[PDB]
Each structure stands twice: as structure tokens, then as C-alpha cells.
Amino acid sequence: TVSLWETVQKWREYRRQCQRSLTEDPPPATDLFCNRTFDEYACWPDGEPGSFVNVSCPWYLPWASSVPQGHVYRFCTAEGLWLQKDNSSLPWRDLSECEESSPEEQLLFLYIIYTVGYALSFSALVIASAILLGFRHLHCTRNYIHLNLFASFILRALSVFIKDAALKWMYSTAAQQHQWDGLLSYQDSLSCRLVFLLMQYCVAANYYWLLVEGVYLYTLLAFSVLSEQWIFRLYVSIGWGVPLLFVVPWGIVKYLYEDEGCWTRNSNMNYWLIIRLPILFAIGVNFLIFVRVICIVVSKLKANDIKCRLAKSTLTLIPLLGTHEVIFAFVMDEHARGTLRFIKLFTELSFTSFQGLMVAILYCFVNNEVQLEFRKSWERWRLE
Amino acid sequence: QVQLQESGGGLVQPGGSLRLSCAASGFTFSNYKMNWVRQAPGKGLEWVSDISQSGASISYTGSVKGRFTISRDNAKNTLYLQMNSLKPEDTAVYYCARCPAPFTRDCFDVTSTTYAYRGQGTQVTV
Amino acid sequence: ASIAQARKLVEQLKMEANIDRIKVSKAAADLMAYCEAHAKEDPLLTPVPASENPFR
Amino acid sequence: ELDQLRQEAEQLKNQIRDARKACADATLSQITNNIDPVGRIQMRTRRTLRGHLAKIYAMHWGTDSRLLVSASQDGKLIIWDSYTTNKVHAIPLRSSWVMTCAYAPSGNYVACGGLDNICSIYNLKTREGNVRVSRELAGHTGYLSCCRFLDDNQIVTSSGDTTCALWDIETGQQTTTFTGHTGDVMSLSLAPDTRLFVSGACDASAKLWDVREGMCRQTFTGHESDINAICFFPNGNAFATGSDDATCRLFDLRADQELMTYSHDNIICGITSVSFSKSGRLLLAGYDDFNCNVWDALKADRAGVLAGHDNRVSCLGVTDDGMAVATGSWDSFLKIWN
Amino acid sequence: HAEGTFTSDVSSYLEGQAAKEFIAWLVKGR
Amino acid sequence: DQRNEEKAQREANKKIEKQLQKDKQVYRATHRLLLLGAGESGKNTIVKQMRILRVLTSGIFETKFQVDKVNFHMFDVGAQRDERRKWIQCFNDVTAIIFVVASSSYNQTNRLQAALKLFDSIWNNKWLRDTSVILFLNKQDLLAEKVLAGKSKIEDYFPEFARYTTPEDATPEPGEDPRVTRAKYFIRDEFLRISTASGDGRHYCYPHFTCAVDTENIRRVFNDCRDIIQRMHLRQYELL
Ligand SMILES: CC(C)CCC[C@@H](C)[C@H]1CC[C@H]2[C@@H]3CC=C4C[C@@H](O)CC[C@]4(C)[C@H]3CC[C@]12C
Ligand SMILES: CC(C)CCC[C@@H](C)[C@H]1CC[C@H]2[C@@H]3CC=C4C[C@@H](O)CC[C@]4(C)[C@H]3CC[C@]12C
Ligand SMILES: CC(C)CCC[C@@H](C)[C@H]1CC[C@H]2[C@@H]3CC=C4C[C@@H](O)CC[C@]4(C)[C@H]3CC[C@]12C
Ligand SMILES: CC(C)CCC[C@@H](C)[C@H]1CC[C@H]2[C@@H]3CC=C4C[C@@H](O)CC[C@]4(C)[C@H]3CC[C@]12C
Ligand SMILES: CC(C)CCC[C@@H](C)[C@H]1CC[C@H]2[C@@H]3CC=C4C[C@@H](O)CC[C@]4(C)[C@H]3CC[C@]12C
Ligand SMILES: CC(C)CCC[C@@H](C)[C@H]1CC[C@H]2[C@@H]3CC=C4C[C@@H](O)CC[C@]4(C)[C@H]3CC[C@]12C
Ligand SMILES: CC(C)CCC[C@@H](C)[C@H]1CC[C@H]2[C@@H]3CC=C4C[C@@H](O)CC[C@]4(C)[C@H]3CC[C@]12C
Ligand SMILES: *c1nc2cc(Cl)c(Cl)cc2nc1NC(C)(C)C
């Protein structure tokens, strides 16, 4: 897309040439003279009264090349004045050749289901964390990994809220007026690029903590015998550290090559691959782990109505690994267009925004160990 | 003082019947799974028949299914074993045993050599 | 043996027979007196202040 | 042959029965109406001692009421400083199935034992600074259920071979054998004067033994199932037994009857641990309920509950000064209550 | 990911709207 | 002063906690197995085959194996009394109880009913309700001889065997007499009738047939232990 800053700079250069030319080109000094003027939109030369003056559509327009040979006219009167309109102080002009040449209905819609999702998930996840830290008997490596998963979910919810606030601030009327007047705006600010670097990091860290969930589950089921403190420190370095191996490069690359906006617009898809491809790797590995764990579960159900318990187990395992994300993971945004793009965005945003809620429910609230902890705390309170 | 006294034994002809009765004292009879154990002459102790707390669940060693019938009377605190179609291989000392703990389904150690919650036994000769 | 164990049972019971027993009231009053006499220095019955509590 | 001696034995049993009944005028349940109740006992977990990896089977306070020994099925005896929760020692054991542990009243030795049928005596005060096995007491033909130090040189152990044994530690030889239980002896309690001890067995009976005579002084029945726990009333003139029939019972040695029965209809779990407070007014009993019920030992009412363990409460110990109650459970944790 | 794709789409929409509003303000007259 | 002794205590506690972390690493990595059975059940056979790949003075016999560099400590409970209800609850966190059955000692003349009753005691013990049992039906070499020759008479002490036929999923060895497989799977089904009645997904039976020359038992338990562990983990995630 053509940015506001660039069209403002183009308009300012247009105004530079306009002022200098308007001073430089001598007037015909014709009788009943029609004076040249600049109304902050287009430059009109002068001429004899009663005729019109045609000038091209200004080249600073964002849609200039879509109106190439279009022209805007200004009419002059017999009086030597510019043609006035009816009951106005401005002269008559016709921009119908330059006026122009919506997805909001969808985006706002997404923004609702998206935001509500996080607004719930964040909430429950906080409560979920408060439970998983609260009950000391629940403390275990699996629980610590779930707590780091809830932290990455809460963190991506917070990054979503903050990046939506920042998108409002970048394009607020005050910021737009600042950019119109050539002044600095919230966009030309390091905090605004760090909001979206934070959003990218939090998304990547949530994906890699879902990956750590899958890998911990697999190493428990693959009958691997490893150090517990070492495995947990490795898992934390993977979930929280490994994102920094592609998030921090990405941001660096942005700052070096693509920093218009606030690193919000993925103009170069090769730089957007820097984050998409590690997330695709986490998604693919965690889906392979999902298939292996469900193979193990059905093998144990067979060695042991299998279809209904297998359904329950699959539907509980889907949120913990984020396997719903493998549906549209490899439908890339370079190729998703129109209705397919909307369905990809809707499915992914709706399911990941509500994913923290489903993980807080399935793995904290309706968890049997947590329910027994609550029952024991309740009966102990009843004993006092 | 857990005390189980068996009675109703004696010598019977092959094919006859005997009602073995176990008078329990010193514990809540209804709380306990009760059973019959058999010490054959020259052999070890073998379990004959389980009856649960309420008497709903009843189990036998296969050698006595269809022939022996075990029942409780939690009102008189007594355990009965009706022996029909008695065979020469049923000749043994019969012990009424209470399995060790109340309100449980496991009944460890009932056929042990020195199990405490077991009667002195009654000789049944066929 | 089958007879010797009854011999040892008779032995143990006969020496357990001639015991200077007291009535259960004189045996309950002793425990009541002991509990009342040592009531105060029981930190589980008269909980001590945190100044005196080594576990606080 | 046998019948004359069996009938002589039952005549002696009836003599015991009548000598018992003649003493039953009015026991605790009517004498102690004239004392106000204990009220609600609200104990809190001041310290939680973490560091054992498996179920804790045994636990013993020192006589300083500060140091604890705790045995878990790791094969570990941890000497804890209960004041600071610091581990003072961690002793790995040659057998992981340790069912008992004892802290010597002098503080220099710690005993342990279990399914290995051996009482290992560890020296806590060596010139090397290392805790090493001082002795191994072998001779029991069943698992070690309870070992109690009579002093630094004498230990009383109870075994699953139905016997108890007094061992001279310096020689390692079993000095006295206490036979007369039919089932496994599960617990020991040494009287404060150390001249007697009391052993509860799987025969649903307890027996009072004279240590220096090796003679069963008394036998106490009244329990319906296995006696898992026994402890002495602080004066040594009574003892409480916790059994698997979900009942605790207090017996007096002189009256030779059970004086009190601590039971409740909502309690169907056996009693694994039995401890008296310093005054003997509170009887603490660990349960398979995962909780420790504090009973009014004279009223036979529940004065309180030490709930907070996540598995079977296996071991109870009240300090010698009465300040705290350590409870260890199968949830791998010790909790100091006060 | 979908959050970066959605942020890029929303930011592109709002940037186009900002450019269109700039042109509208130029047509009104600063 | 007091801070000096406190720092000394913290130093001792840190050394102890480092050793306890190493010991927890060794402990969690080790599978504990209880070995149960009757005297004639052939537990000597099981321990011999495990070690390949008035004599009992200690009350416990720990034999350690390494299968796929996975450590197993199997504890033969020798030198104990025949009353187990108190020391059995000591093995309530063991990975598995390996219950070895004297299946052919039947015609004691009823070792099999004794093993069935011990098995029912083990399932329904509230402390062993989470403890899986690897069931080794140990003496097929004599079960074949007594069943085919009319020496067993399983119908004599188990009359329902007279109405039992080889189940639809049995996998007999080639050439084995159909009545011998009837006896095998009938005994296995008696043990599974005890097992299934009260499992409720907390603990599982892993019945196996073995013999004197059957060394792969060391792997069977291994496989079963792996299965046990996985099911435990699958219960932690509420997947199974
Ligand atoms: C248990 C507690 C932590 C629950 C969490 C409080 C929730 C309900 C609060 C805290 C943060 C809040 C969000 C912060 C930011 C915004 C952006 C703006 O458009 C208003 C809605 C929204 C999205 C808020 C929705 C409600 C919200 C999610
Ligand atoms: C803006 C601020 C609030 C961001 C703070 C992020 C913090 C909470 C994150 C980043 C690094 C993370 C820590 C990384 C390492 C460890 C050590 C581990 O043994 C426990 C978890 C713990 C302690 C993590 C806790 C959460 C953590 C501290
Ligand atoms: C905040 C950002 C910029 C830095 C990230 C630090 C956190 C998230 C991650 C990245 C590197 C990780 C550390 C890598 C190395 C070690 C040393 C090890 O013995 C303990 C864990 C520890 C200490 C890790 C803790 C968590 C860690 C510090
Ligand atoms: C994307 C997520 C949220 C929704 C997708 C649900 C799909 C993928 C899952 C949920 C329920 C699952 C089914 C549950 C039951 C069985 C029976 C089993 O014998 C074959 C697989 C089968 C038929 C599963 C196929 C996949 C399945 C339909
Ligand atoms: C979000 C979507 C993509 C989830 C993935 C759905 C597919 C890949 C998953 C969900 C249900 C799973 C199946 C569930 C049941 C069976 C039948 C069993 O005999 C072999 C495994 C098999 C065949 C699983 C293979 C993988 C499986 C088909
Ligand atoms: C907008 C929707 C998705 C929000 C989700 C809220 C629902 C699905 C969650 C939040 C609270 C949860 C409940 C919390 C408590 C219990 C009681 C337990 O015995 C059964 C599960 C049950 C009943 C949970 C079911 C799922 C539950 C009702
Ligand atoms: C935003 C929503 C999801 C947060 C709602 C908090 C809910 C999910 C939490 C808070 C209190 C929790 C309950 C507290 C007590 C118990 C009793 C126990 O026997 C069943 C679980 C149950 C019922 C818990 C279920 C989950 C619970 C209801
Ligand atoms: C049980 N069985 C099934 C079977 C099938 Cl084919 C589908 Cl699609 C869904 C099922 N659900 C259940 N029970 C739930 C998972 C509890 C709803």
C-alpha cells in the first residue's frame, strides 16, 4: 500500500514546485484577468476570462496511476473571476476525473471475536495460573510447563490488546494531523516498533510453548529417561529463548530494511517468513506429536465405545498442542486471498484467541487433580 | 477379643449333608467379609467360600459350587455353610475365618498358617 | 507342638491371672488427675505465644 | 491330651474375664463428665519438611525436640532441624524398604530397618564427620516394624516374625526375645521409665512386656483388627492403640481393660499412627483418611483435625517438650503442626 | 501467524484510509 | 554467633540437597518391581531368566537389571511370613507387582485357587488399587503334560472349565493341544475376571504365559512397565 507519510511528502514536493512555478511563470495580463492560485490541492495557471483551465490529476495522489489521463478543471467567469458555486465562498471545480478509481466489515468483525476470545482466555488463564501456583500439591514439571504455557498465552493476549491500542494510536486523527503538518508522530517512535516486536515475540513464544507441551508429552510417552531439572531448564530456554532467535533477527531486519509504519505491515514476505517459518516448524512438529500421541492413545484403548473416549481425548489434546492451527498453517498469506484469506484469519484468530480459555478449562478447571485439590480445600474449610 | 467358634461338624456318609455354623464374637460381624477355609488331612489350608458384608456377593472354590451354600445372619452374628452331596475329599478341618479389616474387599492372609481371625475349626469327616 | 503350645498358653495366662488389678474408676481418676495436673505445660492444649513458640 | 490344657487355658481366660469385670464400676466415660472439654484444637502447619522422594514410613523426634529423623522408602533417613527446616543429615540406606526409624535419646545414633529384617544403627557423631553404619542387628526372621532405642547400647525392635527383641548394640547380639504374639508386631512404645514396653500386633491384641525379664506382663484385647500403632500415656500407666478397625482404644495397665474407645461413624479408615500430647489430654491419631484426628483423650470426642496431607498419614510424633507435632505421610512430606 | 497477518491487513486498511483522508482534507482546503 | 551456625547449617543443607537432587535423578529413573508368588510358583525361574539377560537369610532380595539402559530393581520378598497384608502396602508405589503363578502345581493340589485369592486381595487392596500387576502364568511345561494326559482335571476344581472353549483371540503356539490352550486361557480368564471386575482404569493386569526356557520375560516386564508408565502419564493429561 501507499503510505500516508509518502503521499504527504509527495504533496509537499508538489507544493514546493507549485509555489516556485506560480511565482516564476509570468501572467498574460489579459483584460478581465483570471488570477492563478493554489487551493492546497492542485496548481492552476491563469488565462482569459470565461474559459476553463485543465490541469492533470496531481501526481501525489495515492491512486494517481489509476487516473493517468484524468484531469481536473477550474472554470473562469466573464467577470474575470473564477467560477463561483451557489451560496459559497469557494470557486467551482470538478474533480470527478480524480476523485477515486470494504474489508472493514470483516476486520472489525474479526476484531470482536478475536478480542473477546483473548478477553476470556487471558481471564481464565490468570485464574488457571492462580490455581496451578496456588495449590502446592499440584506443583510438578508438567504443571510448571502448563504454567509457562499459560504465561505465554496471557502474554500473547496482552500483546494483542497492546498492538490493537497501538494501531489505534498510529492512525488516530491527532497522529494523522501530525503527519499532514509534517511533524513527528507516534509512528516515528521506538516504542511503537517495540509494541509490534513484542507482539511477534509473544505469538512466537506461545507457539513454542505449545511445542514444549507437545515435546514434554512425547518424551513422557516415548519412555525417555532424562534429568528433570535439566529437561525443565531446556524446555524453558526453548519456549522463552528460542523465539528470540528469529523474533530479534526479524525486528533487526525490519529496522534495517523495512521500518515504515511500526513494523505492522508485512510488505516483504521474505522478512515475514523469518517469523512464519519457525512458527510453521513448531506447528508441524507439534502436529506430528499429536498424531503420535493419538496413536499411542488408540493403541492403549485397543489393548484395554473406544471411539467416544478417543473423541474426548482428541478434543482435549487439540487445545493443548494448538493442532487446530495445522488446518491453515500451510495456506500462506502470500497465497490466501479473498474469502479463503478471511476464512484462514477467522479460523486461526478465533481458535487461538479462545485457545487459552480451552486450555485453562481442560487442563486446569475440569482437571481431576485440580478438582480434588478444590474438594480437599473445601472439606478442610468445612472442618474449620 | 475376636472369637470364632465352629460347630455342626462330625462324621457323615458320602452324599449326605452338614450345616456348619460359626458363632462370631468380639467384633462387628456385619462389617466384615467372612469366609470358610479348609485344612485337608496332610495338606495345607485352602479357601472354601467367601461371603461379603451384606451377603450379596458369594463366591466358592470350584470344588464346592452347587454343593455348599454359605449364608450370613448379621442379626445373630452367625455364618452358615450348608454342605450337600458331601464327598470323601470334603473330609477336613473347616475353619470359619474373618478377613482382617472391615469395610474392605481384600481379604489377605485368611488361608495363612497362623492367621489370627480364624476359628479353632471343626472336623468334618465324610 | 500341638500340646506344648497349650502348655505355654496355660503358663502365660496363669502368670497373667495373679495381677494386682484396680477398679476402672481408680484407673480413670489417675488419667484425669494426670491430664489436669499437666494441663498448662501442654503447648498443643494451651498454645504458647509466638514469643515462646520456636516454630511460631 | 490337648483338651485338658485347652480347657485349663479357657478357665484361666474366664478368670481373667471375671477379674476384669469386677473392676468395671465406672470408667473414664462417666468420671470425666465433670471436666470441661478441650474445645476445638486448631493446629497449623508451621513447617513442611520436603526432601524425601517416596512415602515416609517412620519418623522420630530427638529428645531436644528440635531434630527429627525421618525414614522414606528411598532408602533415606533425613535428620532435619525442625526449627529451620534444614536437613542436618541425609543417610542413604542399604535397603530402601525401611518401615521404622529411631533417634537415640542421646542423639548420637539413629536406627532404621524394615523389610531387610535388619536393624541398622548409624553413628551420627564420628570423628570423620561422616554418618556411617555403626552396627547391623540381624536375627529377626521378619520385617522390622518398630525399633526404639532403650539407650545408646540397647535397642528394642519389633518384627513381622511375631516377636520383639532387645539387642545389645555394641555386641550386635539379640539379648532378649519377647514371644507371644501370633500376628506381626507392628508397633513398639517404650514406657517413660524404660522398664516396660508395649507391642501391638496383627492378632488384634497388645502385650505389655518387662524389658529386663523378657516376660509378657499383660495382654490387652478389645480391638477387632490389626493394631498398627501404639503409644504410652505420658505417665506410663496407660497406652493407646490405633487399629485397622477404624478405632483407637486407651488401655490402663493396672486395671487391665480398655478404658476409652475413640471412634466415629464417619471414620471407616484404620489408624496408622498414635501419639499423645505432653499432658495426655490430646490423643493424636493419623489415619488412612489422610488426616490426623486430635481426640479429647478423656472425653473421646474429636478435638480437632490436622488435615493437609495428600496421602496416608503414616507417622506421628509429638515432641518431648510438647511444643510440636510432626506428621509424616505417604505424600512424601513431613509437616510440623503447632 | 494470523495475528501478524491481521495486523498487517488492518494496518494497510488504516494506512489507505489515512491517505484518503489526507486527500479529502486537501480537497476541503487546509 | 547465631549467624555462624546458621551459615554452617545452610552449607550442610545445600550439600545435602545437591546429593538429594542426584538421588532423585537416580530414583525416578529406576523402576521398582515387587516379585510375588508361591514357593513352587517358579519365582526362582523368573529371577534366573532376569539375571541371564533355608537359603534366604535376608528379608528382601534386590536384583537389578538394565533393559535398554532402563534400570529395574526387582525385590523378591524372601524370608517373610505368609501373612502379607502389612508389608504388601509397602509396595504401593512400586511400578508393578510381578505375580508369578504355580499354574501347573494344581494336582498343594489347589495352588491355582490360592493364587487367584491372593490376586483378588492384591487388586482390591486400597493401597494397591493404583498398582499394576504383571501376571506370569509360569509353568506351561507341566500344564501341558497334566492337561492333555488327563492328569490336570481342571474341571475337578474349576467346573466352569468344562464349559470353557478357547476364546476368539487366543494365539496358541503351533501344534499345541487345544485342551492345553483351553486350560491356559481359562486360567488367564479367571485372573482377568478378577482383574476387570475392579480395575476402573487405575491399574492394569498384564497376563503372560512363560516357562523355564522363556528368557524374554525380562523384556515382557520391560514392555509392560513401559505401558504402565505411559498409562500413568496418559492419566495425568486425561487422555486415557
Ligand atoms: C481475572 C482478571 C485478570 C480478568 C482480566 C480482566 C479483563 C476482563 C480486562 C483486563 C484487560 C482488558 C482489556 C484491555 C484492553 C482493551 C482494549 C480496548 O478495546 C478495551 C477492551 C480491552 C480488550 C480490555 C478488555 C477487558 C480486559 C481483557
Ligand atoms: C514486562 C515484564 C513483566 C516481563 C517479565 C517476564 C518474566 C516474568 C519472564 C521472563 C523470563 C522468565 C523466567 C525465565 C527463567 C525462570 C527460571 C525458572 O526456574 C523459573 C521460571 C523463571 C523464573 C521464568 C519466570 C518468568 C520470567 C521471569
Ligand atoms: C529477557 C530476554 C531478553 C532474555 C531471555 C532470558 C530468559 C528468557 C531465558 C533465555 C536464556 C535462558 C537461560 C539460559 C541459561 C541458563 C543457565 C542454566 O544454568 C539455568 C537456566 C538459564 C539461566 C536460562 C534461564 C532462562 C533464560 C535466561
Ligand atoms: C479442528 C478441531 C477443533 C475440530 C476437528 C475435529 C476432528 C479433527 C476430530 C474430532 C473428533 C475426531 C474423531 C473422534 C472419533 C474417531 C473414532 C476413531 O475410531 C476414528 C477417528 C475418529 C473418527 C476421529 C476423527 C477426527 C475427529 C473427527
Ligand atoms: C486439526 C486436524 C488436522 C487434526 C488432525 C486430524 C487427524 C490427522 C488425526 C485426528 C484423529 C486421528 C486418528 C484417530 C484414530 C485413528 C485410528 C487408529 O487405528 C490409527 C490412528 C488414527 C488413524 C488417528 C490418526 C490421526 C488422526 C486421523
Ligand atoms: C463463552 C464460553 C466458551 C466460556 C466458557 C465457560 C465454561 C465453558 C466453563 C467455565 C467454568 C467451567 C465449569 C467450572 C466448574 C465445573 C464443575 C465440574 O463439576 C464440572 C465442570 C464445570 C461445570 C466446568 C465446565 C466448563 C465451564 C462452565
Ligand atoms: C472465566 C471463568 C472460566 C473463570 C471461572 C472460575 C472457575 C472456572 C473456577 C473457580 C472456582 C473453581 C471451582 C472451585 C471448587 C470446585 C469444587 C470441586 O469439587 C469441583 C471443581 C470446582 C467446582 C472448581 C471448578 C473450577 C472453578 C469453578
Ligand atoms: C461420544 N462418541 C462420539 C462419536 C462420534 Cl462419531 C462423534 Cl463425531 C462424537 C462423539 N462424542 C462422544 N461424546 C463426547 C465427546 C463426550 C461428546
Residue numbers in the entry:
A (entry chain R): 29 to 129, 136 to 338, 344 to 423
B (entry chain N): 1 to 126
C (entry chain G): 7 to 62
D (entry chain B): 3 to 340
E (entry chain P): 7 to 36
F (entry chain A): 11 to 63, 201 to 254, 262 to 394
What do the study authors state?
The high-resolution cryo-EM maps of the compound 2–GLP-1–GLP-1R–Gs and compound 2–LY3502970–GLP-1R–Gs complexes provide a good opportunity to further investigate compound 2-associated positive allosterism. The binding poses of compound 2 in these two structures are nearly identical to that of compound 2 alone except for a slightly different orientation. As seen in the compound 2–GLP-1R–Gs complex, two cholesterol molecules were also found in the identical position of the compound 2–GLP-1–GLP-1R–Gs and compound 2–LY3502970–GLP-1R–Gs complexes, implying a common role for the two cholesterol molecules. In the presence of compound 2, both GLP-1 and the ECD moved inwards to the TMD core by 0.7 and 1.3 Å (measured at the Cα of Y19 in GLP-1 and P90 in ECD), respectively. Upon binding of compound 2, several distinct contacts were formed including a hydrogen bond between T11 in GLP-1 and D372 in ECL3, as well as a salt bridge between R36 in GLP-1 and D215 in ECL1. Meanwhile, Gs moved upward by 0.5–0.8 Å, especially the αN-helix in Gαs and Gβ subunits. Such an alteration may strengthen G protein coupling by introducing several newly formed polar interactions such as two salt bridges (R1762.46b and E4088.49b, E4238.64b and R46 in Gβ).
As one of the most well-known class B1 G-protein-coupled receptors (GPCRs), the glucagon-like peptide-1 receptor (GLP-1R) is a clinically validated drug target for type 2 diabetes and obesity. Ago-allosteric modulators are capable of acting both as agonists on their own and as efficacy enhancers of orthosteric ligands. Here we report high-resolution cryo-electron microscopy (cryo-EM) structures of human GLP-1R–Gs in complex with compound 2 alone, with both compound 2 and endogenous peptidic agonist GLP-1, or with compound 2 and a small molecule agonist (LY3502970).
